[PDB]
Write an enzyme that holds these catalytic residues in place. Structure first.
Site, short mmCIF file in Angstrom:
data_model
loop_
_atom_site.label_atom_id
_atom_site.label_comp_id
_atom_site.label_asym_id
_atom_site.label_seq_id
_atom_site.Cartn_x
_atom_site.Cartn_y
_atom_site.Cartn_z
N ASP A 197 0.82 -1.20 0.00
CA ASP A 197 0.00 0.00 0.00
C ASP A 197 0.86 1.27 0.00
OD1 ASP A 197 -2.86 1.10 0.52
OD2 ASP A 197 -1.64 2.06 2.09
N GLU A 251 1.84 -0.64 -4.65
CA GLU A 251 0.87 0.37 -5.04
C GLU A 251 1.63 1.66 -5.26
OE1 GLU A 251 -1.56 2.28 -2.18
OE2 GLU A 251 -3.25 2.55 -3.55
#
Ligand code: CA
Length: 553
Positions: A197, A251
């Protein structure tokens, strides 16, 4: 070539996948009971969204304990059972890793905020305010300033996102070691993949100077330019991934496309795969809640650039949807009742014929669309609350203006419960779903899709079969026939002498496609919205509205 390059991934958002105890929230047992569905679709591996202990201010992305499972999803036994059932089917699991920040309820932060001399103080970023205000002009993705004053010490802590999501301090050696030990804890369980993330915001700019007015309009990019970013990523690979056999994907949000190879070049030993957002945000304004009209030309040229970035040593993922974006068919296609199924199939063909690891977000194989939001109260997303804070309470916009625009872009569009059948709440739950089910579930549901060989699901299943049976469609080279064409999307996939032609019409009108001079159709693998396959040796194609097709030449 590694297994992940030819694998087809499925993204499960557990909160909205399947509920098994009527609390309105999906859980581990729900996913576990649905593994046969995913296996039947042809799925090799599943990326699950955060499943750790969380106050859920950002639905899993605010972790209060990295070594415990979220209460709503189940217990550690339920997680182990999921792992076991995945392994019995020969399926692999990719978990979400959220280490740019933790929850403010995490024990590290509770101790951190106690005093400046606390052993956990430098686990986070604490700074004195400037000129009676925040340390700097940093804005937050989720509203207001990125700095929050804590009256306990009187300093401000940093949060790129929610205020209850304080950023972890990667500059502190003991913090990094604790994160590395945490990763081992999950990898020791046999986790086959890790998605990182906002992996590019790990490194903070020394001194925290103000952002220039230019940087202000695109602050997401400024947060990715830390000087120690790749140093940390390389170290994490050394201390963790070098000793395991898991695939890593980042990400990579906010990063300019020219810097992407630094993340995924295998020679650099950082990450294996990239989640880029140049394509999925190609029609999004800088404020993230407006839409800017684009054409197929922009669409294909963006893809062409991302592909070239991968080069020979890097590897891309490919996706048209996730938990942070509107539904693929609504976004890139036409979700109107007469075009929804046709365009969803066309987008399916695109997704599963790209050069990279394709990711299918839950519901897109059914052709699920955006939700018909009627009020701002229909939104759960904290990001929308932030838009209301920054734009509505400030008088920059009216509540109606926010509603009308954010409806087309909101992350909640992809977070409505998976539509399994036409029963109560689309078979997602027996109680009241945390987020309302789309009323179109009566026409869009798994049970009807599975029993229909002409459904979106069936087309998805067939494509996955084709890609699996055709090496060139995965690791083969990619070449756009005409990047300037805004009507018909066409490209070739080539590997070891075999060349395959993909042709996708993006118009709701009939179109005609001409093959490159010297290229002829040898075989038709599959077609959507086509009344007739071309003849063997054809040099052109007559396409129906939204017709897609894969051909061997
Ligand atoms: Ca539940």
């Amino acid at each position: 070539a590694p297994w992940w390059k030819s694998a087809v991934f499925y993204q499960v958002y557990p909160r909205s996948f399947k509920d098994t105890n009527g609390d309105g929230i999906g859980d581990f047992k729900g996913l576990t009971e649905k593994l046969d569905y995913l296996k039947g679709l042809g799925i090799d591996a599943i990326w699950i969204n955060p499943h750790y202990a969380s106050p859920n201010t950002d639905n899993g992305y605010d972790i209060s304990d990295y070594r415990e499972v979220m209460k709503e999803y189940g217990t550690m036994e339920d997680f182990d059972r999921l792992m076991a059932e995945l392994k019995k089917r020969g399926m692999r699991l990719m978990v979400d890793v959220v280490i740019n920040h933790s929850s403010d309820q995490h024990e590290w932060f509770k101790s951190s905020r106690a005093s400046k001399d606390n052993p956990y103080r430098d686990y986070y970023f604490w700074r004195d305010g400037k000129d009676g205000h925040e340390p700097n002009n940093y804005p937050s993705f989720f509203g207001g300033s990125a700095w929050e004053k804590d009256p306990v010490t009187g300093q401000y802590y940093l949060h790129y996102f929610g205020r209850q999501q304080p950023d972890l301090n990667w500059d502190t050696p003991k913090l990094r070691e604790e994160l590395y030990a945490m990763l081992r804890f999950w990898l020791d369980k046999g986790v086959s993949g890790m998605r990182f993330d906002t992996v590019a915001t790990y490194s903070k700019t020394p001194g925290f100077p103000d952002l220039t007015p230019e940087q202000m309009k695109n602050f997401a990019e400024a947060y990715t330019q830390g000087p120690n970013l790749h140093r940390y990523l390389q170290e994490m690979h050394e201390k963790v991934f070098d000793h395991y056999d898991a695939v890593t994907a980042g990400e990579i949000f906010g990063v300019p496309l020219n810097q992407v190879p630094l993340f995924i070049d295998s020679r650099r030993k950082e990450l294996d795969m990239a989640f880029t957002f140049d394509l999925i945000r190609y029609d999004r304004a800088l404020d993230r809640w407006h839409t800017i009209p684009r054409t197929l030309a922009d669409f294909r040229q963006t893809i062409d650039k991302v592909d070239a970035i991968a080069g020979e040593y890097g590897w891309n993922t490919f996706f048209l949807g996730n938990h942070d974006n509107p539904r693929a068919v609504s976004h890139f296609g036409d979700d109107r009742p007469q075009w929804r199924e046709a365009s969803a199939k066309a987008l399916a063909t695109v997704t599963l014929t790209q050069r990279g690891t394709p990711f299918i977000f839950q519901g897109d194989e059914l052709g699920m669309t955006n939700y018909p939001f009627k009020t701002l109260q229909d939104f759960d997303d904290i990001e929308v609350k932030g838009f209301f804070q920054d734009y509505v309470e400030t008088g920059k916009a009216t509540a109606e203006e926010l509603l009308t625009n954010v409806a087309l872009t909101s992350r909640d569009n992809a977070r409505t419960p998976f539509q399994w059948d036409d029963s109560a709440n689309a078979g997602f739950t027996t109680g009241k779903p945390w987020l309302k089910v789309n009323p179109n579930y009566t026409e869009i549901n798994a049970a009807r899709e599975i029993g229909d060989p002409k459904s979106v699901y069936s087309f998805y299943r067939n494509l996955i079969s084709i890609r699996h049976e055709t090496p060139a469609l995965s690791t083969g080279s990619y070449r756009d026939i005409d990047p300037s064409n805004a009507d018909v999307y066409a490209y070739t996939r080539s590997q070891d002498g075999e060349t395959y032609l993909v042709v996708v019409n993006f118009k709701a009108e009939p179109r005609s496609f001409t093959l490159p001079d010297g290229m002829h159709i040898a075989e038709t693998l599959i077609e959507s919205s086509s009344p007739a396959a071309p003849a063997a040796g054809a040099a052109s194609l007559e396409l129906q509205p939204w017709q897609s097709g894969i051909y061997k030449v």
